[PDB]
Design a protein around this nucleic acid. Structure first.
Length: 293
DNA sequence: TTCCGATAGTGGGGTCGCAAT
DNA sequence: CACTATCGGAA
């Protein structure tokens, strides 16, 4: 009945890959948190802001799954509030409750939602707290592409980050859902743009002592000591109409080679990339390389 | 054989903790 | 977060 590890989402690129009917909810741009005795982050480390942990641990039933978010605040402000080990904290904050694991993890998503609906009926006060606004996310039924697109337009106008899609009978998988599985899909709209390469930085292999983590995955520290330079491009620094930042994902092995081999000739060339607008502070959020020219 | 799931690993922006300054 | 490279087992 314990949540071995949080359910993660797969990315939807081709809307035709969606299996209908499906259950959708708005995507919250916040910080993940599951109640396992106390409030835990996505990596199962306790939530630093003891006041939030305490308040949520009390209001929510063991096995709750959701995201913490500050209404009207920037993403970074929400991050500061959640990641800071505040002694005392009085500001208002919300918690979007989107899943609930009771006894069996293999219970169908629709049923787990029913559990949420039932629990809320029995404890009305948990949505009335004066400091913590607990917002339940009951999925909406979408039967086709026309409906999904309409729903998307709707949640985006209301300020959400995007839309999350669930297979009705999907189990609560311990780990990341795949596309074929369709258990949990995220749907975000990225914006394409172009920028000029101004420099290149070499790729660095991390040879720090490989350990284990809260789940049993390979964990390696990032001490600059264990970082050994390789003869391939690690990231490029670009100039997006005055804004300077780096793009390091979206390259395959051959490209990292080609880029480093011709580091001289590529400086000054225009690259196409994409990024997510919402949440961007001083430069593009989630920059991903697409191509050249 | 080919495809797909599970991992390890490489990168980005940005904030907090905390020892050193 | 976004993404690539592998490996071993499912299809």
């Amino acid at each position: 009945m314990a949540i071995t590890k949080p359910l993660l989402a797969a990315t939807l690129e081709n809307i035709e890959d969606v299996q209908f009917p499906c259950l959708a909810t708005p995507k919250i741009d916040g910080i993940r948190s599951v109640k396992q005795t106390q409030m835990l982050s996505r990596t199962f480390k306790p939530i630093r802001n003891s006041v939030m942990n305490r308040l949520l641990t009390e209001l929510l039933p063991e096995g709750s799954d959701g995201e913490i978010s500050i209404e009207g605040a920037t993403f970074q402000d929400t991050t500061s509030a959640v990641m800071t080990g505040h002694k005392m904290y009085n500001a208002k904050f919300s918690y979007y409750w989107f899943d609930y694991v009771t006894d069996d993890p293999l219970k169908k998503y629709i049923d787990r939602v029913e559990d949420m609906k039932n629990y809320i009926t029995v404890h009305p006060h948990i949505l009335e707290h004066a400091q913590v606004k607990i917002i339940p996310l009951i999925p909406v039924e979408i039967n086709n592409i026309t409906e999904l697109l309409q729903y998307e337009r709707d949640v985006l106008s209301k300020g959400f980050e995007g839309v999350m899609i669930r297979k009705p009978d999907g189990k609560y998988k311990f780990g990341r859902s795949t596309l074929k599985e369709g258990i949990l899909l995220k749907m975000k709209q990225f914006k394409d743009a172009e920028a000029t390469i101004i420099s290149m930085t070499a790729l660095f292999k991390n040879t720090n002592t490989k350990t284990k983590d809260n789940f049993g995955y390979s964990k390696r520290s990032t001490h600059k000591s264990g970082k050994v330079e390789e003869d391939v491009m690690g990231s490029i620094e670009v100039d997006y109409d005055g804004v300077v930042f780096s793009i390091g994902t979206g390259f395959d092995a051959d490209q990292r080679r080609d880029f480093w081999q011709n580091k001289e000739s590529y400086i000054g060339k225009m690259v196409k990339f994409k990024y997510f607008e919402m949440g961007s502070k001083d430069c593009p959020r989630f920059p991903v390389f697409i191509g050249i020219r």
